[PDB]
Amino acid sequence: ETLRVDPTNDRLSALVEIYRMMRPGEPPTREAAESLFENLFFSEDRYDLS
């Protein structure tokens, strides 16, 4: 059901949706969205579970 209610269809559109939720108003790009999502949880500097 969640997949059904999900308007996104590919990786880039999901990354853009992430960008627009995190940085509303800013027109997202490929590299900006990719860097933002990667730095969210998959960067050892901006994320530590400990």
Binding site: M21, P24, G25, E26
Partner: protein, 45 residues
Amino acid sequence: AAAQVLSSVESEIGRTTDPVRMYMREMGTVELLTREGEIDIAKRI
């Protein structure tokens, strides 16, 4: 061709109020006109 993306952006902004974002969108409209461009512009002056 930058206002044709700003159209969708402003139609789908996240109710933005920060002047940093508004400025950084509009200064980004105009592209880097340097080197040869700058000399041509300097001659028009």
